[PDB]
């Protein structure tokens, strides 16, 4: 299937994830996995009152940029987790961080500490930053 | 739970329902149950190329306004179906129509011919026409 | 150049029109012009608590009467406004948008748009994948 | 009176800015000003295919260098723009919106808003139940 994630829905899932991260005081900062985790990370930062937001950039492996530390007291966030991605690398670099994602495919579940929505292994997900509102012809030309 | 239905999502569900109603040629018109079925009915009419759109109005029972006929060749649409509503009355008035809804609670499933999304019996659903985009304070005042 | 109307924006306009139509009690029902007026009509129905909503499809089908006590609504008015005007001579005719040529044909409208305006309504659109500007 | 910015509108503005920043190849990375510049930054990152995104939190945390080859982005610019200007003297400083007092502080921006403009960003909002205008 093709799972469409709209801006409003991503915000709903993010607020639900933020609620599970309370109390906010247990966190010192947030490390967003670029580029997928940037928007979810910004939403979490807004909800938790956290201003210390950093990034970790990894082309597949090549660490372009890395937030310092072991992730203790930090939340590391990405948009989706599955097998064959960068989840293992993230856990090795920040073994002390709380790793969360918005979405998770079956194979990615054991790689994160928490997530919001379950996605079937076979489902393609379209994120809002990759879409736009445009004219769509009607299904029937009647 | 509180199930939030955004405008974009309602449109996605509606297009998916329209796809199941193809070929369009098997339909002569659409009868929307007011007020819940008005928007879904307008979306279906746009997708199927149907311009003959009528309404059926029923305060709970009192038929304020009724589209004539027995529903043969017509699609009757409402937003949600459950027990204790007007589903039985609709089937009696237009026994020959194709009754569809976007959402269905377990108890309402056997009352309609087709629907798109399953909603738990205990879940409250907020439709987009009842909402708006407004300032929301952060979960944490940190 | 395209004048895009999103669901959120349409809803904001319909609510401005609703507040102008208060008190709701003065109305018997709403007649939506098919298909453009269906969504604006449903929005007014919700805001004004009006359960009696009918339609006019032009004449494939038409609501009874002369529109007395009724609000007739369409989405846009350029130059049907006349057919409605003569079919429901006693109705309060309103639209969300109005182009210069349609302004005198309605009793009220919310948004003024230029005559050459290329407007796209939200029911004709949708959220789809859009290739990035750079292929990098 | 409130100037509301929806996700859809912000995205349209970010894409206009992206097309102005082509070719993407001329850039090494993007430095987003926390937290306002995080979302506009992620949008530019996607449109320009830039994977190197860093942040400056003001100084709780700051990206290395003098901004050479980098795009520094914030959401709005009134009167930090100066701190950035001196921290990354060689960076291309851009914002989505700009109030009159902030205009000369940035190298480029997309939308001009009046100095008394009360702007609300989409990350501070959400879809919630809104009582109908009539209780009928
Ligand atoms: Mg990702
Ligand atoms: Mg209903
Ligand atoms: Mg029209
Ligand atoms: Mg800001």
Q: How close, in Å, is residue B72 to chain D by CA atoms?
A: 34
The domains of chain B are located at 1-142
Stated as kind and residue range, the H or E segment containing C126 is: strand C125-129
The catalytic position among C8, C54, C75, C124 is C75
The resolution, in Å, is 1.8
Residues contacting residue C19 through CB under 8 Å, at least 6 positions apart: C47, D133
The number of C-alpha atoms within 13 Å of C97 and in the hemisphere containing its C-beta is: 20
| DSSP conformation letters of B99-127 | EEEEEE-GGGGGG-SEEEEE--TT-EEE-
Phi, psi of C4 (to 5 degrees): -90, 130
> Residue D121 C-alpha to ligand 1 middle, in angstroms?
24
Q: Between chains, do C134 and D6 touch, taking CB under 8 Å as contact?
A: no
| Chain C partners within 8 Å of D134 (Cβ) | 18, 22-24, 47-49
Contacts of A11 in chain D (CB under 8 A): 7, 122-123, 126
Give the number of the ligand closest to the Cα of residue D46. Answer: 1
Please choose, from the candidates A74, A86, A90, A85, the residue with its C-alpha nearest in 3D space to the C-alpha of residue A29.
A74
Q: Would you say D48 and D27 are in contact if contact means Cβ atoms under 8 Å apart? A: yes
C36 vs chain B: nearest CA distance in angstroms? 8
| Of D77, D84, D16, nearest in space to D44 by CA | D16
Annotated binding residues of C for GMP: 78-80, 118-119
Catalytic residue flag (residue B79)? yes
Tokens of C93: 């005719």
D124 in reach of chain B (CB within 8 A): yes
Closest residue, chain B, to D130 (C-alpha):
B131
The phi and psi torsions of C38 (rounded to 5 degrees) equal -60, -50
The long-range contacts involving B80-88, CB below 8 angstroms and separated by at least 24 positions, are B80/B36, B80/B104, B80/B105, B80/B108, B80/B119, B80/B125, B81/B105, B81/B108, B81/B109, B81/B111, B81/B112, B81/B115, B82/B107, B82/B108, B82/B121, B83/B107, B83/B108, B83/B111, B86/B33, B86/B58, B86/B60, B86/B61, B87/B111, B87/B112
B49 touches chain C (CB under 8 A): no
Distances (CA, A) of A19 to A15, B123, B139, D36: 6, 20, 7, 21
Pairwise CA distance, residues D88 & B93, whole Å: 72
Q: For B22-139, where are the alpha helices, taking DSSP H only?
A: 38-48, 87-93
Chain C CB contacts of D47 below 8 Å: 132-134
Measuring CA to CA, which residue among B62, B90, B59 is closest to residue B75? B90
* Residue among A74, A61, A68 at smallest CA distance from A93: A68
Nearest 5 degrees, angle CA C74-CA C80-CA C85?
Answer: 85
Cβ–Cβ < 8 Å for B139, A47: yes
Give CA separation, C59 vs B37, C33, C34, C84, C106, in Å: 23, 11, 11, 11, 20
User: Sign of the CA dihedral D21, D25, D28, D34?
Assistant: positive
Tell me which H or E stretch contains A119: none
Of the partner residues D22, D25, D134, the one whose CB lies closest to the CB of residue C48: D134
D-chain CB neighbours of B126 within 8 Å are 129
CB contact burial C2-12 (16+ within 10 A = b; e otherwise): eebbbbbbbbe
What lies within 8 Å, CB to CB, of D71 at 6+ separation is D21, D27, D29, D30, D31, D44, D91, D92, D94
Catalytic site residues of A?
Answer: 78-79, 82
Residue where the block lists tokens 């992206």: D18
- D75 burial level (CB within 10 Å; 0-12, 13-18, 19+): buried
Helices (H) and strands (E) in chain B, counts: 3, 9
Nearest-neighbour CA in chain B from C121: distance (Å):
11
Scan for tokens 């999103």, then name that residue: C6
Find the CB nearest D15 among C46, C133, C135.
Answer: C133
The full 3-state SS of A53-97, as one line of letters, equals: EEEEEEECCEEEECCCCCCCCEEEEEEEECCCCCHHHHHHHCCCC
- Radius of gyration for chain A, computed over Cα atoms and rounded to the nearest angstrom: 16
Task: State how far Cα B84 lies from the chain centre.
Answer: 16
Say how many C-beta atoms besides its own lie within 10 A of residue D97's C-beta: 24
Fold of B1-142: Rossmann fold (3.40.50)
Q: Which chains touch A (3 or more CB pairs under 8 A)?
A: B, C, D
CA–centroid distance, D58 to ligand 4, in Å, is 11
- Nearest neighbour of C46 by CB, restricted to B8, B35, B52: B35
DSSP letter for C69, please: T
Quick check: B47 and A8 CB within 8 A?
Answer: no
Which residues from C are below 8 Å from A136, CB to CB?
A: 124-126, 128
Task: Give which of C105, C102, C110, C90 is closest to C29, Cα–Cα.
Answer: C90
- Distance CA(A43)–CA(A89), nearest Å, equals 24
**How far, in Å, are A75, C136, D10 from residue D40 at the CA level?**
21, 18, 8
Whether D133 contacts chain B with CB within 8 A: no
- Strand C125-129 and strand A131-135: the pairing is antiparallel
CATH code of the domain occupying D1-136: 3.40.50.2020
Q: Cα(A81)–Cα(A88) distance, rounded to whole angstroms?
A: 10
| Cα–Cα distance measured from residue D93 to residue D95, given in angstroms and rounded to the nearest whole number | 7
Q: How far apart are CA A137 and CA B24, in angstroms?
A: 15
| Coil vs helix vs strand at A134 | strand
The coordinates were experimentally obtained by X-ray
DSSP letter at B69?
Answer: S
Residues B32, B55 contacting (CB under 8 angstroms) = yes
């Amino acid at each position: 299937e093709k799972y469409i994630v709209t801006w409003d829905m991503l915000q709903i899932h993010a607020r639900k994830l933020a609620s599970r991260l309370m109390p906010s005081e247990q966190w010192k900062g947030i490390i967003a996995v670029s580029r997928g985790g940037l928007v979810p990370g910004a939403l979490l930062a807004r909800e938790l009152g956290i201003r210390h937001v950093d990034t970790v950039c990894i082309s597949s492996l090549k660490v372009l940029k890395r937030a310092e530390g072991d992730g203790e007291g930090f939340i590391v966030i990405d948009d989706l987790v599955d097998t064959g991605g960068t989840a293992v690398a993230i856990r090795e670099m920040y073994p002390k961080a709380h790793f969360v994602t918005i979405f998770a495919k079956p194979a990615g579940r054991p790689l994160v500490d928490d997530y919001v929505v379950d996605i079937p292994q076979d489902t393609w997900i379209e994120q809002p930053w990759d879409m736009g509102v445009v004219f769509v012809p009607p299904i029937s030309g009647r």
